[PDB]
Design a protein around this nucleic acid. Structure first.
Ligand SMILES: [K+]
Ligand SMILES: [K+]
Ligand SMILES: [K+]
Ligand SMILES: [K+]
Ligand SMILES: [K+]
Ligand SMILES: [Mg+2]
Ligand SMILES: [Mg+2]
Ligand SMILES: [Mg+2]
Ligand SMILES: [Mg+2]
Ligand SMILES: [Mg+2]
Ligand SMILES: [Mg+2]
Ligand SMILES: [Mg+2]
Ligand SMILES: [Mg+2]
Ligand SMILES: [Mg+2]
Ligand SMILES: [Mg+2]
Ligand SMILES: [Mg+2]
Ligand SMILES: [Mg+2]
Ligand SMILES: [Mg+2]
Ligand SMILES: [Mg+2]
Ligand SMILES: [Mg+2]
Ligand SMILES: [Mg+2]
Ligand SMILES: [Mg+2]
Ligand SMILES: [Mg+2]
Ligand SMILES: [Mg+2]
Ligand SMILES: [Mg+2]
Ligand SMILES: [Mg+2]
Ligand SMILES: [Mg+2]
Ligand SMILES: [Mg+2]
Ligand SMILES: [Mg+2]
Ligand SMILES: [Mg+2]
Ligand SMILES: [Mg+2]
Ligand SMILES: [Mg+2]
Ligand SMILES: [Mg+2]
Ligand SMILES: [Mg+2]
Ligand SMILES: [Mg+2]
Ligand SMILES: [Mg+2]
Ligand SMILES: [Mg+2]
Ligand SMILES: [Mg+2]
Ligand SMILES: [Mg+2]
Ligand SMILES: [Mg+2]
Ligand SMILES: [Mg+2]
Ligand SMILES: [Mg+2]
Ligand SMILES: [Mg+2]
Ligand SMILES: [Mg+2]
Ligand SMILES: [Mg+2]
Ligand SMILES: [Mg+2]
Ligand SMILES: [Mg+2]
Ligand SMILES: [Mg+2]
Ligand SMILES: [Mg+2]
Ligand SMILES: [Mg+2]
Ligand SMILES: [Mg+2]
Ligand SMILES: [Mg+2]
Ligand SMILES: [Mg+2]
Ligand SMILES: [Mg+2]
Ligand SMILES: [Mg+2]
Ligand SMILES: [Mg+2]
Ligand SMILES: [Mg+2]
Ligand SMILES: [Mg+2]
Ligand SMILES: [Mg+2]
Ligand SMILES: [Mg+2]
Ligand SMILES: [Mg+2]
Ligand SMILES: [Mg+2]
Ligand SMILES: [Mg+2]
Ligand SMILES: [Mg+2]
Ligand SMILES: [Mg+2]
Ligand SMILES: [Mg+2]
Ligand SMILES: [Mg+2]
Ligand SMILES: [Mg+2]
Ligand SMILES: [Mg+2]
Ligand SMILES: [Mg+2]
Ligand SMILES: [Mg+2]
Ligand SMILES: [Mg+2]
Ligand SMILES: [Mg+2]
Ligand SMILES: [Mg+2]
Ligand SMILES: [Mg+2]
Ligand SMILES: [Mg+2]
Ligand SMILES: [Mg+2]
Ligand SMILES: [Mg+2]
Ligand SMILES: [Mg+2]
Ligand SMILES: [Mg+2]
Ligand SMILES: [Mg+2]
Ligand SMILES: [Mg+2]
Ligand SMILES: [Mg+2]
Ligand SMILES: [Mg+2]
Ligand SMILES: [Mg+2]
Ligand SMILES: [Mg+2]
Ligand SMILES: [Mg+2]
Ligand SMILES: [Mg+2]
Ligand SMILES: [Mg+2]
Ligand SMILES: [Mg+2]
Ligand SMILES: [Mg+2]
Ligand SMILES: [Mg+2]
Ligand SMILES: [Mg+2]
Ligand SMILES: [Mg+2]
Ligand SMILES: [Mg+2]
Ligand SMILES: [Mg+2]
Ligand SMILES: [Mg+2]
Ligand SMILES: [Mg+2]
Ligand SMILES: [Mg+2]
Ligand SMILES: [Mg+2]
Ligand SMILES: [Mg+2]
Ligand SMILES: [Mg+2]
Ligand SMILES: [Mg+2]
Ligand SMILES: [Mg+2]
Ligand SMILES: [Mg+2]
Ligand SMILES: [Mg+2]
Ligand SMILES: [Mg+2]
Ligand SMILES: [Mg+2]
Ligand SMILES: [Mg+2]
Ligand SMILES: [Mg+2]
Ligand SMILES: [Mg+2]
Ligand SMILES: [Mg+2]
Ligand SMILES: [Mg+2]
Ligand SMILES: [Mg+2]
Ligand SMILES: [Mg+2]
Ligand SMILES: [Mg+2]
Ligand SMILES: [Mg+2]
Ligand SMILES: [Mg+2]
Ligand SMILES: [Mg+2]
Ligand SMILES: [Mg+2]
Ligand SMILES: [Mg+2]
Ligand SMILES: [Mg+2]
Ligand SMILES: [Mg+2]
Ligand SMILES: [Mg+2]
Ligand SMILES: [Mg+2]
Ligand SMILES: [Mg+2]
Ligand SMILES: [Mg+2]
Ligand SMILES: [Mg+2]
Ligand SMILES: [Mg+2]
Ligand SMILES: [Mg+2]
Ligand SMILES: [Mg+2]
Ligand SMILES: [Mg+2]
Ligand SMILES: [Mg+2]
Ligand SMILES: [Mg+2]
Ligand SMILES: [Mg+2]
Ligand SMILES: [Mg+2]
Ligand SMILES: [Mg+2]
Ligand SMILES: [Mg+2]
Ligand SMILES: [Mg+2]
Ligand SMILES: [Mg+2]
Ligand SMILES: [Mg+2]
Ligand SMILES: [Mg+2]
Ligand SMILES: [Mg+2]
Ligand SMILES: [Mg+2]
Ligand SMILES: [Mg+2]
Ligand SMILES: [Mg+2]
Ligand SMILES: [Mg+2]
Ligand SMILES: [Mg+2]
Ligand SMILES: [Mg+2]
Ligand SMILES: [Mg+2]
Ligand SMILES: [Mg+2]
Ligand SMILES: [Mg+2]
Ligand SMILES: [Mg+2]
Ligand SMILES: [Mg+2]
Ligand SMILES: [Mg+2]
Ligand SMILES: [Mg+2]
Ligand SMILES: [Mg+2]
Ligand SMILES: [Mg+2]
Ligand SMILES: [Mg+2]
Ligand SMILES: [Mg+2]
Ligand SMILES: [Mg+2]
Ligand SMILES: [Mg+2]
Ligand SMILES: [Mg+2]
Ligand SMILES: [Mg+2]
Ligand SMILES: [Mg+2]
Ligand SMILES: [Mg+2]
Ligand SMILES: [Mg+2]
Ligand SMILES: [Mg+2]
Ligand SMILES: [Mg+2]
Ligand SMILES: [Mg+2]
Ligand SMILES: [Mg+2]
Ligand SMILES: [Mg+2]
Ligand SMILES: [Mg+2]
Ligand SMILES: [Mg+2]
Ligand SMILES: [Mg+2]
Ligand SMILES: [Mg+2]
Ligand SMILES: [Mg+2]
Ligand SMILES: [Mg+2]
Ligand SMILES: [Mg+2]
Ligand SMILES: [Mg+2]
Ligand SMILES: [Mg+2]
Ligand SMILES: [Mg+2]
Ligand SMILES: [Mg+2]
Ligand SMILES: [Mg+2]
Ligand SMILES: [Mg+2]
Ligand SMILES: [Mg+2]
Ligand SMILES: [Mg+2]
Ligand SMILES: [Mg+2]
Ligand SMILES: [Mg+2]
Ligand SMILES: [Mg+2]
Ligand SMILES: [Mg+2]
Ligand SMILES: [Mg+2]
Ligand SMILES: [Mg+2]
Ligand SMILES: [Mg+2]
Ligand SMILES: [Mg+2]
Ligand SMILES: [Mg+2]
Ligand SMILES: [Mg+2]
Ligand SMILES: [Mg+2]
Ligand SMILES: [Mg+2]
Ligand SMILES: [Mg+2]
Ligand SMILES: [Mg+2]
Ligand SMILES: [Mg+2]
Ligand SMILES: [Mg+2]
Ligand SMILES: [Mg+2]
Ligand SMILES: [Mg+2]
Ligand SMILES: [Mg+2]
Ligand SMILES: [Mg+2]
Ligand SMILES: [Mg+2]
Ligand SMILES: [Mg+2]
Ligand SMILES: [Mg+2]
Ligand SMILES: [Mg+2]
Ligand SMILES: [Mg+2]
Ligand SMILES: [Mg+2]
Ligand SMILES: [Mg+2]
Ligand SMILES: [Mg+2]
Ligand SMILES: [Mg+2]
Ligand SMILES: [Mg+2]
Ligand SMILES: [Mg+2]
Ligand SMILES: [Mg+2]
Ligand SMILES: [Mg+2]
Ligand SMILES: [Mg+2]
Ligand SMILES: [Mg+2]
Ligand SMILES: [Mg+2]
Ligand SMILES: [Mg+2]
Ligand SMILES: [Mg+2]
Ligand SMILES: [Mg+2]
Ligand SMILES: [Mg+2]
Ligand SMILES: [Mg+2]
Ligand SMILES: [Mg+2]
Ligand SMILES: [Mg+2]
Ligand SMILES: [Mg+2]
Ligand SMILES: [Mg+2]
Ligand SMILES: [Mg+2]
Ligand SMILES: [Mg+2]
Ligand SMILES: [Mg+2]
Ligand SMILES: [Mg+2]
Ligand SMILES: [Mg+2]
Ligand SMILES: [Mg+2]
Ligand SMILES: [Mg+2]
Ligand SMILES: [Mg+2]
Ligand SMILES: [Mg+2]
Ligand SMILES: [Mg+2]
Ligand SMILES: [Mg+2]
Ligand SMILES: [Mg+2]
Ligand SMILES: [Mg+2]
Ligand SMILES: [Mg+2]
Ligand SMILES: [Mg+2]
Ligand SMILES: [Mg+2]
Ligand SMILES: [Mg+2]
Ligand SMILES: [Mg+2]
Ligand SMILES: [Mg+2]
Ligand SMILES: [Mg+2]
Ligand SMILES: [Mg+2]
Ligand SMILES: [Mg+2]
Ligand SMILES: [Mg+2]
Ligand SMILES: [Mg+2]
Ligand SMILES: [Mg+2]
Ligand SMILES: [Mg+2]
Ligand SMILES: [Mg+2]
Ligand SMILES: [Mg+2]
Ligand SMILES: [Mg+2]
Ligand SMILES: [Mg+2]
Ligand SMILES: [Mg+2]
Ligand SMILES: [Mg+2]
Ligand SMILES: [Mg+2]
Ligand SMILES: [Mg+2]
Ligand SMILES: [Mg+2]
Ligand SMILES: [Mg+2]
Ligand SMILES: [Mg+2]
Ligand SMILES: [Mg+2]
Ligand SMILES: [Mg+2]
Ligand SMILES: [Mg+2]
Ligand SMILES: [Mg+2]
Ligand SMILES: [Mg+2]
Ligand SMILES: [Mg+2]
Ligand SMILES: [Mg+2]
Ligand SMILES: [Mg+2]
Ligand SMILES: [Mg+2]
Ligand SMILES: [Mg+2]
Ligand SMILES: [Mg+2]
Ligand SMILES: [Mg+2]
Ligand SMILES: [Mg+2]
Ligand SMILES: [Mg+2]
Ligand SMILES: [Mg+2]
Ligand SMILES: [Mg+2]
Ligand SMILES: [Mg+2]
Ligand SMILES: [Mg+2]
Ligand SMILES: [Mg+2]
Ligand SMILES: [Mg+2]
Ligand SMILES: [Mg+2]
Ligand SMILES: [Mg+2]
Ligand SMILES: [Mg+2]
Ligand SMILES: [Mg+2]
Ligand SMILES: [Mg+2]
Ligand SMILES: [Mg+2]
Ligand SMILES: [Mg+2]
Ligand SMILES: [Mg+2]
Ligand SMILES: [Mg+2]
Ligand SMILES: [Mg+2]
Ligand SMILES: [Mg+2]
Ligand SMILES: [Mg+2]
Ligand SMILES: [Mg+2]
Ligand SMILES: [Mg+2]
Ligand SMILES: [Mg+2]
Ligand SMILES: [Mg+2]
Ligand SMILES: [Mg+2]
Ligand SMILES: [Mg+2]
Ligand SMILES: [Mg+2]
Ligand SMILES: [Mg+2]
Ligand SMILES: [Mg+2]
Ligand SMILES: [Mg+2]
Ligand SMILES: [Mg+2]
Ligand SMILES: [Mg+2]
Ligand SMILES: [Mg+2]
Ligand SMILES: [Mg+2]
Ligand SMILES: [Mg+2]
Ligand SMILES: [Mg+2]
Ligand SMILES: [Mg+2]
Ligand SMILES: [Mg+2]
Ligand SMILES: [Mg+2]
Ligand SMILES: [Mg+2]
Ligand SMILES: [Mg+2]
Ligand SMILES: [Mg+2]
Ligand SMILES: [Mg+2]
Ligand SMILES: [Mg+2]
Lengths: 88, 273
RNA sequence: AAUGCUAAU
RNA sequence: CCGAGGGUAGGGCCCGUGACUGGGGCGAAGUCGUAACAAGGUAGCUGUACCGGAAGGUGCGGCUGGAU
RNA sequence: UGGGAGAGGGUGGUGGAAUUCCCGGAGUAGCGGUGAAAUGCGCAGAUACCGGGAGGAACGCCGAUGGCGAAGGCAGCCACCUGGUCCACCCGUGACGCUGAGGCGCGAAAGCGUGGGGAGCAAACCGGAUUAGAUACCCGGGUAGUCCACGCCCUAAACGAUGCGCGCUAGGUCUCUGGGUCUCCUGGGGGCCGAAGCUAACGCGUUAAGCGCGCCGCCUGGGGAGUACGGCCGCAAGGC
RNA sequence: AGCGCCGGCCAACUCCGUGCCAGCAGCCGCGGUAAUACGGAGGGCGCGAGCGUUACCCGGAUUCACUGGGCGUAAAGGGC
RNA sequence: GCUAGUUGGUGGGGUAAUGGCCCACCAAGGCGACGACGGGUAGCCGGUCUGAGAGGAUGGCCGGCCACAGGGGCACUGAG
RNA sequence: CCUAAGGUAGCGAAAUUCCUUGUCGGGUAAGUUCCGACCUGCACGAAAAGCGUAACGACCGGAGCGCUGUCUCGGCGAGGG
RNA sequence: GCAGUGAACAGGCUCUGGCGACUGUUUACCAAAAACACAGCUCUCUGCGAACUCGUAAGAGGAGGUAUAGGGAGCGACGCU
RNA sequence: GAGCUAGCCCUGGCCAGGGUGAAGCUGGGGUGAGACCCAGUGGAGGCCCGAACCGGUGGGGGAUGCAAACCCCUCGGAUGA
């Protein structure tokens, strides 16, 4: 699972200001962490379709957040995808 | 992981070949190879005694260590997995801490860099060789001696294995690759694991020429001959068998049993295959 | 356990 | 040079027709059985599979638009 | 951020009950089956009983009008990996939302391909009864299949025969699961009865089939017919 | 001075002939020995230099519903 | 799914005149589920018939525009 | 009535059909061969496998086009005899 | 110029059946094929001093192989059976 | 008697020239990640055309032959059983 320590490390890494926990960048970073871990799980557990539906839901949510960020701040959007290696 | 071909010739449509990805070294060890004498199915009288043999690719014999109690208690490191033309299984080159080099039948799951050892105190790991009475019931084994210090005789072909079913006095019950239940002396040696290259039976030769590469000459049906040559020969046009199907030498060949009736080893066979 | 009853209130 | 038209060859689509063959709709009467409507006399229906002159039967699972 | 419940999913192990088979013991004149029988099995020693061993498949009581999931579906127990969802705090972002023609993924059973496995059951098949006949219903056998891995197939009374989202409109009662000021109040699910309203009626009724808005799908008499032709998909069966 | 109609829709009824025949018919349907539905006659109704019939278009058809319909069980919610 | 003078550019020819209208060369473009391309059908309008309206059907005669003059192609003369 | 049981799918005038040049359709001016059907299978039929099948064949059938001394029907010329 | 691979060397084509899947093999000297073989399918034997073959025997082959292996038999790619 | 012929064993040799363009690899596209798609490269095959070489399909000639199996034209294989 994902422990509180790595989650807090990500939150501090991507937050704009110290007390920030729900900005677009932080949400995208947490979604990317979950997606990476779940895809690693699914590379071994191929017949795990029920988890794969959740992965699809996560990918869609991140796509919506990225679209909003790109539409409201192109510089922030480009910096975030460069830092996360999202494009592809 | 058998490799297939696109049908760019009539023969390549069906032919499959082995993957060979597990082979690490492509030349045999010089000190462990001997010339192999091709017979063509002829005996020392010069007479064909086994029909339809000869004309395959030239081969060199690799010396395999089938008596692993020779070096009990001396560990060896697996140096390579090699191709062997003389058997369906692959072979493994062992680098003993002694500086002695030997070949063994490569088990399934053996890797370059592992350690193997033979002896009554060996761990139960793939590649280790122990007397049968020291191996737990239910273990899968291969390269099994039939009688003590006489050499491994059972479960040597690719993908085969025997499983220990129980114990009875000085004897251990084994289920053989054929399904036969047999009693084997507990002091006979065996190696842990199953023989590798289990995909060997999925190979499709694809063309007549590939059989010739393997030294198998064409087989002629008895019904294609004349009566002087074969019991099935003759008849005008095609013919049915006209009698119980028979060999070229007269004996029936559908169900007639041939094991010698009063054989001593029958006392040690619990159930036939 | 036991099938069927055409065609004009 | 282009050029109406004509000729040659190979395609695409459509229409008419054809020994034979498949089912469909219809019928104030025929032959065979009786599958469904009542617990329709083995509850029915259903997807699939195999089988049988025929309606149909059976296997596996599902539904109640059945009972208890 | 802190907590909760759960047959949600995938992988690896392992517990006993029972059926079948084999070995040994003891023992004898039938057992089995039906409406009644017969086929069958059994003195070459069956059935009933005790001990040992092997193997496969399914998990009794708990257990439910219970729970989880988008649907199909999910039930011994243990460990690991993983999805959804609920409550409390009212902390952060700042409309970032809803729906969705095509596309992609999933999708009971049966079925198909290649290997494995095979106790029990059991399409096809064989025999016995029944009957006018009995290609059935009942009985004795019996192969695929049912199980596992991988790959296809993509259908159903795939049903709540009720698309999804949001807001508004008396209550009563039963139950699962949270929080609290634990009489009681306040969330989230699952049922029953009923205001107003609706409906051809049956019935529905805060889990709407009421009152409204947004977007998608579908219908236009019955048969012919989910057929034909064309096209696409599939190894095939066949699907759209 | 003619043509159509006279069972209901739809206005205008009796007698004779026939007997599932002959025939009528837009739908429902009439006719098988007592027919307001067939044929004729008497009478009646509607139009009238016209009166009927066939073909085609709109209406009635809110039966493609923008005005102005629906999808639990009538046809209709896509398996998710 | 369609398109190879096809889509654009440069220069020229031709015309009363713009223009790939036509030619030579350079680039690789143009169109399409808001339905290209293909098949079927058809002269279009003012109007006309129907209808409570919305809508549906239709384009005989009359006025306007287009196309054609036995079936195809072509130019001459000329303001045309 | 008889049998251990009475030939299933598919195919069928066939490298299998005696009557036979069966019959119907096509191809030709004219077709005992050929192709498509029908079923009356003398005497098909499921690993002496049944029914299909892209590609391949100095295999064996049938037809058309091109072109020709094969022929109508022969004539002349060259070289070796 | 009648004519430009100007001489020499260098596929006639198409349509439709049967049989065999295919490349191969065969009656030296009348038969090259539809026959044989063939990859592949199935049955059966064989636990190793294996079965089986040659040999009076010793001894060989099988095989310095070990049931995913070896021998015998029938069918003959593949699809549906 | 295997200096012919059949099979096998050991050790050597030979196969002009041209065509086709498998896998793999590289780069781009595609996706949550993929499967896949495209181009280039690459040089596989009882692959194709064709001499040597190995065969021997059809026809003509030969028939007290050049020859007790030949000659001419044509034809099969030609990196493989
Ligand atoms: K053979
Ligand atoms: K026939
Ligand atoms: K015959
Ligand atoms: K031919
Ligand atoms: K390539
Ligand atoms: Mg292949
Ligand atoms: Mg390939
Ligand atoms: Mg291919
Ligand atoms: Mg090929
Ligand atoms: Mg081929
Ligand atoms: Mg080939
Ligand atoms: Mg081949
Ligand atoms: Mg080497
Ligand atoms: Mg050496
Ligand atoms: Mg000798
Ligand atoms: Mg000798
Ligand atoms: Mg032999
Ligand atoms: Mg031999
Ligand atoms: Mg040879
Ligand atoms: Mg060899
Ligand atoms: Mg060699
Ligand atoms: Mg090997
Ligand atoms: Mg071997
Ligand atoms: Mg070889
Ligand atoms: Mg051989
Ligand atoms: Mg062999
Ligand atoms: Mg040979
Ligand atoms: Mg061979
Ligand atoms: Mg044989
Ligand atoms: Mg013979
Ligand atoms: Mg012979
Ligand atoms: Mg004899
Ligand atoms: Mg004999
Ligand atoms: Mg014989
Ligand atoms: Mg004979
Ligand atoms: Mg014979
Ligand atoms: Mg003979
Ligand atoms: Mg004969
Ligand atoms: Mg013969
Ligand atoms: Mg014969
Ligand atoms: Mg013969
Ligand atoms: Mg025969
Ligand atoms: Mg024969
Ligand atoms: Mg015979
Ligand atoms: Mg025979
Ligand atoms: Mg016989
Ligand atoms: Mg015999
Ligand atoms: Mg026999
Ligand atoms: Mg033996
Ligand atoms: Mg009755
Ligand atoms: Mg009745
Ligand atoms: Mg009756
Ligand atoms: Mg009755
Ligand atoms: Mg009655
Ligand atoms: Mg009745
Ligand atoms: Mg009645
Ligand atoms: Mg037609
Ligand atoms: Mg019934
Ligand atoms: Mg009844
Ligand atoms: Mg009934
Ligand atoms: Mg009745
Ligand atoms: Mg009944
Ligand atoms: Mg019933
Ligand atoms: Mg019944
Ligand atoms: Mg009933
Ligand atoms: Mg019922
Ligand atoms: Mg059924
Ligand atoms: Mg089946
Ligand atoms: Mg049945
Ligand atoms: Mg008895
Ligand atoms: Mg007993
Ligand atoms: Mg068992
Ligand atoms: Mg679920
Ligand atoms: Mg979920
Ligand atoms: Mg706040
Ligand atoms: Mg603010
Ligand atoms: Mg919204
Ligand atoms: Mg849409
Ligand atoms: Mg499924
Ligand atoms: Mg189900
Ligand atoms: Mg299943
Ligand atoms: Mg299966
Ligand atoms: Mg019965
Ligand atoms: Mg009776
Ligand atoms: Mg039964
Ligand atoms: Mg049973
Ligand atoms: Mg069975
Ligand atoms: Mg459902
Ligand atoms: Mg529905
Ligand atoms: Mg609805
Ligand atoms: Mg929807
Ligand atoms: Mg509630
Ligand atoms: Mg309630
Ligand atoms: Mg209720
Ligand atoms: Mg209610
Ligand atoms: Mg309620
Ligand atoms: Mg309603
Ligand atoms: Mg309608
Ligand atoms: Mg269909
Ligand atoms: Mg079709
Ligand atoms: Mg297909
Ligand atoms: Mg269907
Ligand atoms: Mg009146
Ligand atoms: Mg009338
Ligand atoms: Mg009248
Ligand atoms: Mg009268
Ligand atoms: Mg009237
Ligand atoms: Mg009258
Ligand atoms: Mg009006
Ligand atoms: Mg009306
Ligand atoms: Mg209207
Ligand atoms: Mg109206
Ligand atoms: Mg409306
Ligand atoms: Mg309506
Ligand atoms: Mg409804
Ligand atoms: Mg309703
Ligand atoms: Mg209904
Ligand atoms: Mg309707
Ligand atoms: Mg309905
Ligand atoms: Mg639904
Ligand atoms: Mg439905
Ligand atoms: Mg579903
Ligand atoms: Mg140009
Ligand atoms: Mg142009
Ligand atoms: Mg242009
Ligand atoms: Mg106007
Ligand atoms: Mg008006
Ligand atoms: Mg108006
Ligand atoms: Mg006009
Ligand atoms: Mg015009
Ligand atoms: Mg004209
Ligand atoms: Mg005229
Ligand atoms: Mg003038
Ligand atoms: Mg002029
Ligand atoms: Mg048949
Ligand atoms: Mg046949
Ligand atoms: Mg046939
Ligand atoms: Mg014939
Ligand atoms: Mg004939
Ligand atoms: Mg035939
Ligand atoms: Mg004949
Ligand atoms: Mg004859
Ligand atoms: Mg004739
Ligand atoms: Mg004839
Ligand atoms: Mg004829
Ligand atoms: Mg004829
Ligand atoms: Mg003809
Ligand atoms: Mg002809
Ligand atoms: Mg003709
Ligand atoms: Mg003709
Ligand atoms: Mg003709
Ligand atoms: Mg004729
Ligand atoms: Mg004829
Ligand atoms: Mg002929
Ligand atoms: Mg002829
Ligand atoms: Mg002919
Ligand atoms: Mg013929
Ligand atoms: Mg024929
Ligand atoms: Mg014929
Ligand atoms: Mg006929
Ligand atoms: Mg027929
Ligand atoms: Mg006949
Ligand atoms: Mg046959
Ligand atoms: Mg048979
Ligand atoms: Mg036979
Ligand atoms: Mg046979
Ligand atoms: Mg055959
Ligand atoms: Mg056949
Ligand atoms: Mg065939
Ligand atoms: Mg084909
Ligand atoms: Mg092909
Ligand atoms: Mg072919
Ligand atoms: Mg072909
Ligand atoms: Mg080819
Ligand atoms: Mg071909
Ligand atoms: Mg070819
Ligand atoms: Mg060829
Ligand atoms: Mg061919
Ligand atoms: Mg050939
Ligand atoms: Mg020939
Ligand atoms: Mg020939
Ligand atoms: Mg040939
Ligand atoms: Mg010939
Ligand atoms: Mg023929
Ligand atoms: Mg031919
Ligand atoms: Mg011919
Ligand atoms: Mg001709
Ligand atoms: Mg000709
Ligand atoms: Mg001449
Ligand atoms: Mg001549
Ligand atoms: Mg000439
Ligand atoms: Mg002539
Ligand atoms: Mg002549
Ligand atoms: Mg003559
Ligand atoms: Mg003549
Ligand atoms: Mg002449
Ligand atoms: Mg002459
Ligand atoms: Mg003359
Ligand atoms: Mg002459
Ligand atoms: Mg002359
Ligand atoms: Mg002359
Ligand atoms: Mg002359
Ligand atoms: Mg002369
Ligand atoms: Mg000359
Ligand atoms: Mg001369
Ligand atoms: Mg002379
Ligand atoms: Mg000249
Ligand atoms: Mg000339
Ligand atoms: Mg000339
Ligand atoms: Mg020239
Ligand atoms: Mg030339
Ligand atoms: Mg030339
Ligand atoms: Mg030349
Ligand atoms: Mg020359
Ligand atoms: Mg050529
Ligand atoms: Mg050639
Ligand atoms: Mg030609
Ligand atoms: Mg040809
Ligand atoms: Mg033909
Ligand atoms: Mg034929
Ligand atoms: Mg042919
Ligand atoms: Mg023939
Ligand atoms: Mg055949
Ligand atoms: Mg052949
Ligand atoms: Mg042949
Ligand atoms: Mg073939
Ligand atoms: Mg074939
Ligand atoms: Mg073959
Ligand atoms: Mg074949
Ligand atoms: Mg063959
Ligand atoms: Mg065949
Ligand atoms: Mg080949
Ligand atoms: Mg060849
Ligand atoms: Mg070839
Ligand atoms: Mg050949
Ligand atoms: Mg051949
Ligand atoms: Mg040959
Ligand atoms: Mg040869
Ligand atoms: Mg030979
Ligand atoms: Mg041969
Ligand atoms: Mg000869
Ligand atoms: Mg000869
Ligand atoms: Mg010869
Ligand atoms: Mg010879
Ligand atoms: Mg001779
Ligand atoms: Mg000859
Ligand atoms: Mg010959
Ligand atoms: Mg030949
Ligand atoms: Mg040949
Ligand atoms: Mg010859
Ligand atoms: Mg041949
Ligand atoms: Mg043959
Ligand atoms: Mg032969
Ligand atoms: Mg092959
Ligand atoms: Mg094959
Ligand atoms: Mg086969
Ligand atoms: Mg076998
Ligand atoms: Mg065998
Ligand atoms: Mg044997
Ligand atoms: Mg042998
Ligand atoms: Mg001896
Ligand atoms: Mg030996
Ligand atoms: Mg040897
Ligand atoms: Mg030996
Ligand atoms: Mg064998
Ligand atoms: Mg064999
Ligand atoms: Mg056989
Ligand atoms: Mg046999
Ligand atoms: Mg053969
Ligand atoms: Mg075959
Ligand atoms: Mg054969
Ligand atoms: Mg000799
Ligand atoms: Mg020799
Ligand atoms: Mg020799
Ligand atoms: Mg020699
Ligand atoms: Mg030789
Ligand atoms: Mg040789
Ligand atoms: Mg050799
Ligand atoms: Mg050698
Ligand atoms: Mg050599
Ligand atoms: Mg050598
Ligand atoms: Mg040599
Ligand atoms: Mg050289
Ligand atoms: Mg060569
Ligand atoms: Mg060469
Ligand atoms: Mg070259
Ligand atoms: Mg070459
Ligand atoms: Mg080529
Ligand atoms: Mg080349
Ligand atoms: Mg090329
Ligand atoms: Mg090459
Ligand atoms: Mg070749
Ligand atoms: Mg070639
Ligand atoms: Mg060729
Ligand atoms: Mg060839
Ligand atoms: Mg060739
Ligand atoms: Mg040559
Ligand atoms: Mg030569
Ligand atoms: Mg040779
Ligand atoms: Mg030669
Ligand atoms: Mg030669
Ligand atoms: Mg030869
Ligand atoms: Mg020849
Ligand atoms: Mg000639
Ligand atoms: Mg010739
Ligand atoms: Mg000749
Ligand atoms: Mg000559
Ligand atoms: Mg001659
Ligand atoms: Mg001559
Ligand atoms: Mg000659
Ligand atoms: Mg001679
Ligand atoms: Mg010669
Ligand atoms: Mg020549
Ligand atoms: Mg040649
Ligand atoms: Mg050739
Ligand atoms: Mg050759
Ligand atoms: Mg050849
Ligand atoms: Mg060839
Ligand atoms: Mg060659
Ligand atoms: Mg060559
Ligand atoms: Mg060649
Ligand atoms: Mg070549
Ligand atoms: Mg070579
Ligand atoms: Mg080649
Ligand atoms: Mg080779």
């Amino acid at each position: 699972p994902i422990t509180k320590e790595e989650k807090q490390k990500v939150i501090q890494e991507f937050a704009r200001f110290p007390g920030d926990t729900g900005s677009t960048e932080v949400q995208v970073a947490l979604l990317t962490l979950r997606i990476n871990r779940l895809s690693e799980h699914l590379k071994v557990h191929k017949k795990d379709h029920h988890s794969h539906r959740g992965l699809l839901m996560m990918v869609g949510q991140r796509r919506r957040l990225l679209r909003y960020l790109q539409r409201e701040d192109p510089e922030r959007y480009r910096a975030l995808i460069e830092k996360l290696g999202i494009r592809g | 992981a058998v490799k297939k071909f696109k049908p760019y010739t009539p023969s390549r449509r069906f032919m499959t070949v082995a993957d060979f990805s597990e082979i690490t070294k492509t030349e045999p060890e010089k000190s462990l190879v001997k010339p192999l004498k091709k017979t063509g199915g002829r005996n020392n009288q010069g007479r064909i005694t086994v029909r339809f043999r000869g004309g395959g690719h030239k081969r060199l014999y690799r010396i395999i260590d089938f008596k692993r109690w020779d070096k009990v208690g001396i560990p060896a490191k697996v140096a390579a997995i090699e191709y062997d033309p003389n058997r369906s299984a692959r072979i493994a080159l062992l680098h003993y801490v002694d500086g002695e080099k030997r070949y063994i039948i490569a088990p399934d799951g053996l890797q370059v860099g592992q350690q193997v050892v033979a002896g009554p105190d060996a761990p139960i790991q793939v590649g280790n060789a122990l007397p049968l009475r020291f191996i737990p019931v239910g273990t899968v084994v291969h390269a099994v001696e039939l009688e003590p210090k006489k050499g491994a005789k059972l479960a040597r072909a690719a993908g085969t294995s025997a499983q220990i079913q129980g114990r009875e006095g000085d004897y251990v019950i084994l289920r053989l690759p054929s399904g036969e239940l047999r009693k084997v002396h507990g002091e006979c040696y065996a190696t842990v694991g199953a023989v590798g290259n289990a995909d060997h039976k999925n190979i499709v030769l694809g063309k007549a020429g590939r059989s010739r590469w393997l030294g198998r000459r064409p087989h002629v049906r008895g019904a294609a001959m004349n009566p002087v040559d074969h019991p099935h020969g003759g008849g005008e046009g095609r013919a049915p068998r006209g009698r119980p199907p028979a060999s070229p030498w007269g004996w029936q060949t559908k169900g007639l049993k041939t094991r010698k009736r009063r054989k001593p080893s029958s006392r040690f066979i619990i159930a036939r295959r």
